[PDB]
Each structure stands twice: as C-alpha cells, then as structure tokens.
C-alpha cells in the first residue's frame, strides 16, 4: 500500500509537471531527468518489495532453503555488523 | 442559386475533390430553402446536417467504463476473508470519477437535456455505489458471531436451506 | 503629479500623473474552498497515532493517502497561484509545511510499526530502551 | 512487551506532532493578521 | 465450547456466502439490463432520412 | 444614454416599455422571467436647466439548474451516502479506514472537478459551495469517529480495564433503550 | 478465556457505538441536505 | 497545380502549393509519457508473484488501472477527437487496460480459490492431482 | 494457478506491447514527397531546363 500510493502520488504530480516542463524535444530538461530517476527508483523499489514479500511468505511447503542463502543471510550478513 | 444545368439545385455546393474533410463530423444532408416572410424581409437558409463520428469516445470513455463495471461485478466473487473488497470497489469508483473528470471537459453546458453518456456514467456510478453497499452488508454478515448476535430462525431457514438450492450451492 | 528632470544634456522635462489604486483581496473564497479543507486534512494526519500498530491497522494507509490528497490540493492550488518567483505565498508555505509534517508522520508510523511488529525470534530487546519506554516514560 | 513499547512511542509522538503542527500552522496563518492594508494619510477612496 | 462457537461462525459465514451469491446474480441482471437498454437507445438514434420531414 | 448630449439638447424616449423579445433565440441556460425599460431624468446641483436622460433596460433571468444538479449534486450525494455507511462495516474487516479515506480521496478528486464548474466568486458562499463544505466536513467527522471507534475496539484489558460506568451504559442500557 | 472475554466486552461496546453512530450519521446526511436545499426549493416552488 | 477540368476563367483552375512533410521529434514524449506508461503497465505482472497472504494483490492491479486512467486523461487532451484512427499510444493504453482488467479478474479468482475451506468447498482428488503434481511439474515449480 | 496465469499473461503483454511499438517506430515518411513521382524535389537535384 505504501509503495503503490507513493507511485500514485508521483504519477498525479507528473500530471502537473508535464505541462510546466517545456515540450522542446531537442534535449531532456534536468528536472525531467530527475523525474525519470524518481519514477525508475519507485518502480525498482516496488519490484524489490514484491520479491522480499514473496521471500517472507515462503515455507517448507516450498521445500528446503538452499544452503547458500542460509550461509549468506542467516550466518554471514548479521555477523558483518 | 441554380445548379449548373439551371435546375433548382437548392444545395450547399461541395467540391468533392477539394473539400477539406472534417475528421469528427460527416456531412449527410446539405439542402437550402428560400424562406418567405410571415419591413418584411426574405431569408435564404442553408442547412448542414452532420453526424458525429463516435470512435474517440467509444475508445476513451465507454470501454474503460465497461471494464470498470466488469470489475465492480467481480467484487462479489472476492471472498470476504481477503480483506480487499472495499479497496477494489472504492478504487473502481475513484477511477470512474477520474473518467468523469475527463468527460466534463467534453460535455455541453446546456441544461435542456442530459447526454446519454452522462446518464450512462451516472448509472455506472450508482452501480458501483450499490456494489459498495452490498459488499459492506456481506462483510457485516461475515463477522457476526455468538459473542455479538444470535441468528434468528427465519434467516437460518431461508439462507441456509432455501436459497442455496436455487443458487446450486451445497454446504459440505 | 510628477515632474521628471531631463537628460544630462538638460533637455526638456516631462510630466506624469500617477494614480495609485490600493486594493485589498476578499479572502472568503479561498478560506472556504482551500484553507479550511487543507487544515482539516492536515489535522487528519494526527489521527494516525490512535490507529493500533497491529494487524488490521491502517496507519500508513491513512498517512500516505492524506499526503496524496495534499498532492491533489497542490495541483489545485498551483492553478491559482501566479508563476512569479519573487516570494513564496503564505498558502504555499502552509502547503509545504503540511507536506513535510505529513512525511514526518509517515516516518513515525513506519518506525512505530517496525517497533511493534518485532518478535523475539528476530530482535533482542535492549534493556535500556525497555526501561525507558515502559518505566521511565510513565514515571516522567 | 514490544507492543507496549510501540504504544508508548505512539502516545508520546502524538503529543509531539500535535504541538508541532499547532504551533507551525498558527505561526504561518498569523501573518494574515499583521499584513492588512496599512493606515495612510490619504482619504479613503469611497466616502462613507 | 470453542467448537460450538466455530460452528455458529461457520453458519454465519455460509449465510454471508449465500447472500454474496444472490447479490452477484442480482447485480449481473441489473447491470446487463441497464447497459443493454442504454446501448440500444444510443444505437437506434439514426440520422434522419429526410431534411424536411 | 447619450454620452455628450444632455436632455435639453437631445431627448431619448423608449419605443415600448419592454424590450422586443420576438426575435429572441431560446437560451439553453437561462429563462427571462420579466423585462422592462425605465426612462430616468436626473438633475445635478449645478444646472436646473440641463437634465440628463438615460433609459435602463433590465432582465430578470432564472437559471435552469438541471446541468449543475446532475453534474455535481448526484456524485456528492453518493459520497455523502457512502460516508455514513462505514459505521455498518465491522472493525474486524480491517477496511473501515480504507473505505473512509478512499471516499475522501474520491471527494477531493470531484472537488477538483467542481472547481471547473462553480464560480470563484468571493462575495458570498454559494449554496452549492456550502453543500460541498458540509460534505467535506461530514467525511472528516466520520473519519475521526471511525478512528475513535477503532481505538476503542482494539483496547486491551491488560492496561485499560473497562470502568463500570462504560459497562452499565453501553452493555446494559444501550441495547435496552 | 478471561482475557478474550474482557476484550470481547470492548468489541461489543465498539459495535454498539458503531450502531448508534450509523443511525446518527445516516440521519445527519438527510438533515443537512434538507437544511441547505429546502428553503430555496420552497422559494422557487412558491 | 493546374486543374484541367475547371473553366479557364474559374478561380480554382491554378494555384501554387508548397508542402511541408514534417516528422515529430519523439524524445520528449518517449521520456515523459511512454516510459512511465509502459513501466507502470508492466508492474501488473508482479501481481502473480505477490503472495495471496499479503492481501494486496488486487490493490496493485486496480491502482495501475487508475494510473492508466490518469495517463488516458492526460493524453486524450493532447490530440484531436478524430475518427480516422486510434493513436498508437491510445492503442497501447486500451490494450494495457484490457490486460489489467483481465489480471484483476484472474486475481479475484485466485484469491477466491486461496481462501476456500472444507467448510465451504470440496477439493476433488483429480483437482488435487492436476494442480499439485502435473501442473507444477510442467511449470517447474 | 498464479504461476500458470503469470506464464500465460506476461508473454502476451510483452508481445502486444512490442507489436504496437515496433509498428510505430518503423513509421517513416516516404523518400519521395509524392508517391508515384520519382523526383525528389531536393535542392541537390536542380532540374535544369
Ligand atoms: C502530401 O499531401 C499532398 C496533398 O495534400 C499529396 O499530393 C498528392 O499526391 C498524390 C500522389 O501522387 C497525387 O495523386 C496523383 O496526382 C496526379 C496528378 O493528377 C492531376 O493532374 C493530371 C494532369 O496533370 C490529371 O490527369 C489528373 O486527373 C486525374 O485525377 C483526378 C482527381 O481524382 C480525376 O478526377 C481524373 O479523372 C484523373 O484521374 C489530375 O488533375 C495523377 O496523375 C495521379 O493519378 C495516378 O495515380 C492514381 C492513384 O495514385 C491512379 O488512380 C491514376 O489512374 C493514375 O495512375 C498513375 O499513372 C501514372 C502515369 O502513367 C503512373 O506512373 C502511376 O504508376 C499510376 N498509378 C497507379 C496507382 O496506377 C494521382 O492522382 C495527388 O493529386 C496530389 N495532390 C495534390 C498535388 O494536391 C502528397 O502526395 C502527400 N505526400 C505524402 C503523403 O508523402
Ligand atoms: C432542421 O432545422 C430546420 C429549422 O431549424 C427544420 O426546418 C423546419 O422543417 C419543418 C418540417 O418541414 C417545417 O415545418 C413545416 O413548415 C411549413 C411552413 O410553415 C410556414 O407556413 C405555414 C403556412 O403554410 C405557416 O403556418 C407557418 O407559420 C410558417 O410560416 C408548414 O406548412 C408545415 O406544416 C410544417 O409546419 C419548419 O417550418 C421548418 N423550419 C424552417 C425554419 O425552415 C428542418 O426540418 C430540420 N431538419 C431536420 C432533419 O430535423
């Protein structure tokens, strides 16, 4: 809900920004590049959030976790801090 | 003005290979009439009868509303335990409101009559509103418990025995 | 009536008549249609702290959707405010303050949910923070 | 115990945010009072 | 006692499901009728065959 | 009125007491209920010899409200009806806030629609504007009350035992009132 | 069981509040609609 | 241009016509509309990967439908309402909205299946074999 | 069912999007301004008398 509402707000704001940004297609405006960055950033955040949520809801019904995932995330990473 | 043959060709002349064709309107009838007086003056009236080509509104308004209505129907197929029924129904209503915002730029402001598309939009909004109301009723029924309510005998009879046979439902 | 000196060549002077219309806006329209709605919407954000930080709670939902509503108002407000860059309108300052506060409330809701949703299988409770939150704060 | 800590954080943050919002909004709107039209030696444009 | 509570809850949930199906059917009927009427009315509105009937 | 000629030099007289409406094209938005033209002859303190003449025509027009009724009132009525409905939705659904806030969002979008239609006059609050503000405040109050009810439902007896007055009111009297 | 019953008491109180508030708000809707419109509706009728 | 049919004394017989064949520079629209519209539309494929127990699968699809509605509002204001053809971006929007609606329907069916119980439905052995042995083997689950 | 519908719908979405956008991209003005006229009307092809 959080990520999707952020995306919705960003799109509603793009609806206002596209009319202020000049339509001159010789080069991208700096604000346009910043908007593209923000959009791609939100999209990537949503994709990764979906991956994380799918990971969380796995169970032994999904069959055993591969040992390298345990070695990395359960053993290694929490010891690195 | 007469036609080139001298016949009473009382029509708007259109150069068939030179006329700049309008993309939204199709010319069907184009007659003219001399109007006699009832200070009396005559008038020559030229009539353009033109039909709107609807493809723009078919694509951009009607089909989205059909899709939204189809989604508002499937609201009732979503199980109450999913917890997304209100989200779906109200977001469908919000999308319909956005398409209403779209159409409001297009409709005439004259109040002598209501456009059929406006009637269709209002009917669709009424449908979504009733879908919301009935989903709230269903969710109210779903969360009743002996800690809060006792089911009366008539509800038990009708809904557990009579209606399932009509709906081809069977309790396991 | 103004009289202006000529050029440095001591040319002929000039005369103007200037009338100054000092006019005052009637604010009623914007108070009803913008200011009061935005104020009440921003007040709605503070209600999030009373939504339980528990399954079925909608704290982030409320805060983010109120922020989206404020963005819709920003669209609405931006149609009225002139495009000059000499200063920031009072309504614009209030709008930006409201949006910043709303983002802070979103952050606080996220923090509170992150605190409440913890489990002994994932987090070891710090005894200092435990004592502060459960004992020192009620004693304060 | 984690739930109780979360509730305590909610309770303190509510008052903090309420005070911050009230003060900020009041100080922002307060400018409307002070920036009324100034008094001037000129006669009013429309006589009573 | 918990089993009896669960039985009563299941009874209420079955009532809710039956009501949901009835609403689905009635809403399908109302939607189909209204949309069909509207589209038929819009489609029969042909341009006139005569500029001066 | 004649701009530079005065009544001692040029006199104007109305042809008829009403404007000629025989050629009037029927408006799709206003109905002219009545009209008239009055001749006026003011005199100024400089000059009793030179009255100044004007003819003031006027038209009493009443709006045909159907367009605004259909395009504003009905959606606002739907939102107002859905506003109170939330109190029938059980808290266990976990969707009361979603419902109320999404209704608020839809009402805000329709306000964005409404601002295109209603006048931006500041002389006085329009009746439609009063109704819009009423609907918005009603939604906000419903949201506040929903938050209070949700906070009541999830209250834990470990920290907040129910006081006897709350019990004797709500459990005993209210369902028996 | 004791804790669940004590929580269900609060749930029942909240439900009773919900019913009262539903009745009040559904009345207030039409009350406000009539209060705003009826005066001018009568004026235009009469 | 000399029209041979027009009378020599007619004004339409001759003219000099200058033509401009002009290609739109697409980069502005590609950056500002097309890439957002495509990316947001492709977001719907994640709904199938989103677990049902999250209770957010319909939210994503319906919000993407709302975003596509917003884009349709934006784009439709930029073009004349001609009936000669549907613009390319309009075709893409229509196709995307159709697919998003289909995915919403599919998600509703999936959620209806997920919350089924032996108190309300009977899971046949053939259905069990099909959806737990054959299909997951074919799909490399 | 989720994975089945993913494998069904996702390639349909991708193929339809590609089919639309490639049909758009390869739209080009004809190399001669009038179809059926071989002359370019370009400044380089001065058609001397
Ligand atoms: C941008 O827009 C502009 C306009 O806004 C476009 O310009 C048009 O370009 C097209 C394509 O070339 C032009 O169409 C051709 O025009 C010529 C000129 O015809 C005129 O002059 C002739 C003598 O000068 C005269 O005979 C012609 O009369 C003919 O046409 C009229 C009009 O309908 C009829 O009423 C008559 O009965 C008669 O047919 C006219 O005054 C034409 O010669 C040419 O005709 C050929 O092509 C047609 C189909 O394209 C066929 O139906 C014809 O039979 C004829 O066939 C062609 O004959 C050639 C000679 O042997 C042969 O080489 C060729 O292969 C063969 N083609 C075929 C398909 O069989 C045709 O009508 C149009 O007039 C232009 N309009 C203008 C200039 O205003 C421009 O193209 C656009 N640019 C783009 C899109 O990039
Ligand atoms: C498009 O709009 C046009 C006007 O905006 C329509 O024209 C109208 O068409 C109708 C149908 O024919 C006419 O009605 C007829 O009128 C004649 C003439 O009336 C006059 O003469 C009689 C005496 O003979 C007199 O009583 C009248 O007052 C008139 O002075 C009548 O003889 C017929 O019985 C009938 O009433 C309208 O008159 C005509 N109006 C105009 C201004 O021309 C046209 O039909 C519309 N087209 C479509 C397709 O709807």
UniProtKB/Swiss-Prot annotation, chain B:
<feature type="transmembrane region" description="Helical">
    <location>
        <begin position="86"/>
        <end position="104"/>
    </location>
</feature>
<feature type="transmembrane region" description="Helical">
    <location>
        <begin position="54"/>
        <end position="78"/>
    </location>
</feature>
<comment type="similarity">
    <text>Belongs to the ligand-gated ion channel (TC 1.A.9) family. Acetylcholine receptor (TC 1.A.9.1) subfamily. Beta-1/CHRNB1 sub-subfamily.</text>
</comment>
<feature type="transmembrane region" description="Helical">
    <location>
        <begin position="120"/>
        <end position="141"/>
    </location>
</feature>
<comment type="function">
    <text>After binding acetylcholine, the AChR responds by an extensive change in conformation that affects all subunits and leads to opening of an ion-conducting channel across the plasma membrane.</text>
</comment>
<comment type="subunit">
    <text>Pentamer of two alpha chains, and one each of the beta, delta, and gamma (in immature muscle) or epsilon (in mature muscle) chains. The muscle heteropentamer composed of alpha-1, beta-1, delta, epsilon subunits interacts with the alpha-conotoxin ImII.</text>
</comment>
<protein>
    <recommendedName>
        <fullName>Acetylcholine receptor subunit beta</fullName>
    </recommendedName>
</protein>
UniProtKB/Swiss-Prot annotation, chain C:
<comment type="similarity">
    <text>Belongs to the ligand-gated ion channel (TC 1.A.9) family. Acetylcholine receptor (TC 1.A.9.1) subfamily. Epsilon/CHRNE sub-subfamily.</text>
</comment>
<feature type="topological domain" description="Extracellular">
    <location>
        <begin position="79"/>
        <end position="93"/>
    </location>
</feature>
<feature type="transmembrane region" description="Helical">
    <location>
        <begin position="94"/>
        <end position="115"/>
    </location>
</feature>
<protein>
    <recommendedName>
        <fullName>Acetylcholine receptor subunit epsilon</fullName>
    </recommendedName>
</protein>
<comment type="function">
    <text>After binding acetylcholine, the AChR responds by an extensive change in conformation that affects all subunits and leads to opening of an ion-conducting channel across the plasma membrane.</text>
</comment>
<feature type="topological domain" description="Cytoplasmic">
    <location>
        <begin position="52"/>
        <end position="59"/>
    </location>
</feature>
<feature type="transmembrane region" description="Helical">
    <location>
        <begin position="60"/>
        <end position="78"/>
    </location>
</feature>
<feature type="transmembrane region" description="Helical">
    <location>
        <begin position="27"/>
        <end position="51"/>
    </location>
</feature>
<comment type="subunit">
    <text>Pentamer of two alpha chains, and one each of the beta, delta, and gamma (in immature muscle) or epsilon (in mature muscle) chains. The muscle heteropentamer composed of alpha-1, beta-1, delta, epsilon subunits interacts with the alpha-conotoxin ImII.</text>
</comment>
UniProtKB/Swiss-Prot annotation, chain G:
<protein>
    <recommendedName>
        <fullName>Acetylcholine receptor subunit alpha</fullName>
    </recommendedName>
</protein>
<feature type="topological domain" description="Extracellular">
    <location>
        <begin position="40"/>
        <end position="46"/>
    </location>
</feature>
<feature type="transmembrane region" description="Helical">
    <location>
        <begin position="19"/>
        <end position="39"/>
    </location>
</feature>
<comment type="similarity">
    <text>Belongs to the ligand-gated ion channel (TC 1.A.9) family. Acetylcholine receptor (TC 1.A.9.1) subfamily. Alpha-1/CHRNA1 sub-subfamily.</text>
</comment>
UniProtKB/Swiss-Prot annotation, chain H:
<comment type="function">
    <text>After binding acetylcholine, the AChR responds by an extensive change in conformation that affects all subunits and leads to opening of an ion-conducting channel across the plasma membrane.</text>
</comment>
<comment type="similarity">
    <text>Belongs to the ligand-gated ion channel (TC 1.A.9) family. Acetylcholine receptor (TC 1.A.9.1) subfamily. Delta/CHRND sub-subfamily.</text>
</comment>
<feature type="transmembrane region" description="Helical">
    <location>
        <begin position="92"/>
        <end position="113"/>
    </location>
</feature>
<protein>
    <recommendedName>
        <fullName>Acetylcholine receptor subunit delta</fullName>
    </recommendedName>
</protein>
<feature type="transmembrane region" description="Helical">
    <location>
        <begin position="58"/>
        <end position="79"/>
    </location>
</feature>
<feature type="transmembrane region" description="Helical">
    <location>
        <begin position="26"/>
        <end position="50"/>
    </location>
</feature>
<comment type="subunit">
    <text>Pentamer of two alpha chains, and one each of the beta, delta, and gamma (in immature muscle) or epsilon (in mature muscle) chains. The muscle heteropentamer composed of alpha-1, beta-1, delta, epsilon subunits interacts with the alpha-conotoxin ImII.</text>
</comment>
């Amino acid at each position: 809900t959080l990520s999707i509402s952020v995306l919705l707000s960003l799109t509603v704001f793009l609806l206002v920004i596209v009319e202020l940004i000049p339509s001159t297609s010789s080069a991208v405006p700096l604000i346009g590049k910043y908007m593209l960055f923000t959009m791609v950033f939100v999209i990537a955040s949503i994709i990764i959030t979906v991956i994380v949520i799918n990971t969380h809801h796995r169970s032994p019904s999904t069959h055993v976790m591969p040992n390298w995932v345990r070695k990395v995330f359960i053993d290694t990473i929490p010891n690195i801090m | 003005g007469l036609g080139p043959d001298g016949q009473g060709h009382q029509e708007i002349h259109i150069h068939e290979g030179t006329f700049i064709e309008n993309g939204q309107w199709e010319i069907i009838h184009k007659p003219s009439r001399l109007i006699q007086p009832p200070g009396q003056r005559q008038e020559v009236i030229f009539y353009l009868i033109i039909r709107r080509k609807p493809l723009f509104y078919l694509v951009n308004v009607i089909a989205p509303c059909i899709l939204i209505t189809l989604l508002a129907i499937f609201v009732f197929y979503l199980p109450p335990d999913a917890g997304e029924k209100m989200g779906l129904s109200i977001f469908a209503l919000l999308t319909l409101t956005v398409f209403l915002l779209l159409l409001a730029d297009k409709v005439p402001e004259t109040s002598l009559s209501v456009p059929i598309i406006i009637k269709y939009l209002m009917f669709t909004m009424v449908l979504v509103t009733f879908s919301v109301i009935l989903s709230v009723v269903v969710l109210n029924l779903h969360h009743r418990s002996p800690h809060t309510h006792q089911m009366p005998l008539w509800v038990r009879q009708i809904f557990i025995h009579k209606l399932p046979l009509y709906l081809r439902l069977k309790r396991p | 009536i103004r009289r202006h000196h000529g050029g440095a060549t001591d040319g002929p002077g000039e005369t103007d008549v200037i009338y100054s219309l000092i006019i005052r806006r009637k604010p009623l329209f914007y108070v009803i249609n913008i200011i009061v709605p935005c104020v009440l919407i921003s007040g709605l954000v503070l209600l999030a702290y009373f939504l339980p930080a528990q399954a079925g709670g909608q704290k982030c939902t409320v805060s983010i959707n109120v922020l989206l509503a404020q963005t819709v108002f920003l669209f609405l407000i931006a149609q009225k405010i002139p495009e000059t860059s000499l200063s920031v309108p009072l309504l614009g300052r209030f709008l930006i303050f409201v949006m910043v506060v709303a983002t802070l409330i979103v952050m606080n809701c996220v923090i509170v949910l992150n605190v409440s949703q913890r489990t002994p299988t994932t987090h070891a409770m710090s005894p200092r923070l435990r004592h502060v939150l459960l004992e020192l704060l009620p004693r304060l | 115990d984690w739930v109780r800590m979360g509730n305590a954080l909610d309770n303190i943050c509510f008052w903090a945010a309420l005070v911050l919002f009230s003060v900020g909004s009041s100080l922002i709107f307060l400018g409307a009072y002070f920036n009324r039209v100034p008094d001037l030696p000129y006669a009013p444009c429309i006589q009573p | 006692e918990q089993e009896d509570h669960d039985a009563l809850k299941e009874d209420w949930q079955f009532v809710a499901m039956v009501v949901d199906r009835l609403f689905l059917w009635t809403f399908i009927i109302f939607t189909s009728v209204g949309t069909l009427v509207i589209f038929l009315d819009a489609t029969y509105h042909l341009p006139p065959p005569d500029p001066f009937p | 009125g004649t701009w530079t000629y005065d009544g001692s030099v040029v006199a104007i007289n109305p042809e008829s007491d009403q404007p000629d409406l025989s050629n009037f094209m029927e408006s799709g938005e206003w109905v002219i209920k009545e009209s008239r033209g009055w001749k006026h002859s003011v005199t100024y303190s400089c000059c009793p010899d030179t009255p100044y003449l004007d003819i003031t025509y006027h038209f009493v027009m009443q709006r045909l409200p159907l367009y605004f009724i259909v395009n504003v009132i009905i959606p606002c009525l739907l939102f107002s009806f859905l506003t109170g409905l939330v109190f029938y939705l059980p808290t266990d659904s976990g969707e009361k806030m979603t419902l109320s806030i999404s209704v608020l969002l839809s009402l805000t979008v329709f306000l964005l629609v409404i601002v295109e239609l209603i006048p931006s006059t500041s002389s006085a609050v329009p009746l439609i504007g009063k109704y819009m503000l009423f609907t918005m405040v009603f939604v906000i109050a419903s949201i506040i009350i929903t938050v209070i009810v949700i906070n009541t439902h999830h209250r834990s007896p470990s920290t907040h035992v129910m006081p006897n007055w709350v019990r004797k009111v709500f459990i005993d009297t209210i369902p028996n009132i | 069981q004791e804790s669940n019953n004590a929580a269900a008491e609060w749930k029942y109180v909240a439900m009773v509040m919900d019913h009262i508030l539903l009745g009040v708000f559904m009345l207030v809707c039409i009350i406000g609609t009539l209060a705003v419109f009826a005066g001018r509706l009568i004026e235009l009728n009469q | 241009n000399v029209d041979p049919r027009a009378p020599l004394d007619s004004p339409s017989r001759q003219d000099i016509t200058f033509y401009l064949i002009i290609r739109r520079k697409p980069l502005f629209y590609i950056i500002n509309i097309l890439v957002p519209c495509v990316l947001i539309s492709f977001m719907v494929n994640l709904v199938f990967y989103l677990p049902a127990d999250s209770g957010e699968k319909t939210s994503v699809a319906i919000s993407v439908l709302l975003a596509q509605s917003v884009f349709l509002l934006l784009i439709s204001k930029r073009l004349p309402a001609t009936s000669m053809a549907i613009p390319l971006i309009g075709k893409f929007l229509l196709f995307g909205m159709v697919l998003v609606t289909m995915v919403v329907v599919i998600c509703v069916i999936v959620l209806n299946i997920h919350f089924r119980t032996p108190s309300t439905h009977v899971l046949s052995e053939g259905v069990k074999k099909l959806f737990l042995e054959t299909l997951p083997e074919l799909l490399h689950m | 069912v989720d994975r089945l519908c993913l494998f069904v719908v996702t390639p349909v979405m991708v193929v339809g999007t590609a089919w639309i956008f490639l049909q758009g991209v390869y739209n080009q003005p004809p190399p001669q301004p009038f179809p059926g006229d071989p002359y370019s009307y370009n400044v380089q092809d001065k058609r001397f008398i």
